[PDB]
């Protein structure tokens with residue numbers, strides 16, 4: 001028993017995964033997914049370890065750096081989530097891993113906005129968000145999803 005999925009790893013949909021920050025102990029597991037892309041939601045530069053992994057596996061890195069904030073001073077930037085959604089919705093980029101640091105807040109908001117585009121009721125989106133965020137669930141993340149306007153992605 002030798003494969004180690006990254007922190008808070010899950011399959012979201014066909015070709016879409018979510019996690020926290022992968023380390024070298026997770027690389028043999030991530031190889032089994034045949035990733036084409038990573039959507040990385042933190043502003044910090046990617047470590048050399050991770051860069052060598054992407055190069056060796058032909059994985060494209062999309063970075064939309066969202067600053068970590070604490071409640072009640074959270075300000076999730078709409079523009080970054082929408083740039084990440086544009087990448088996520090293009091099947092040419094699949095399989096894709098979405099990750100942040102913990103895979104709960106930034107990752108949770110992006111997945112919740114995908115669920116809204118997939119026409120899930122808000123209570124079902126919030127339930128999935130809360131399952132990953134657990135004791136760190138933020139009302140501000142769920143409020144962001146509540147008011148997210150799908151109009152410009154509806155097509």
Ligand SMILES: O=[P-]([O-])[O-]
Nearest residue numbers: 101102104105106
């Ligand atoms: O690192 P994250 O849970 O936004």
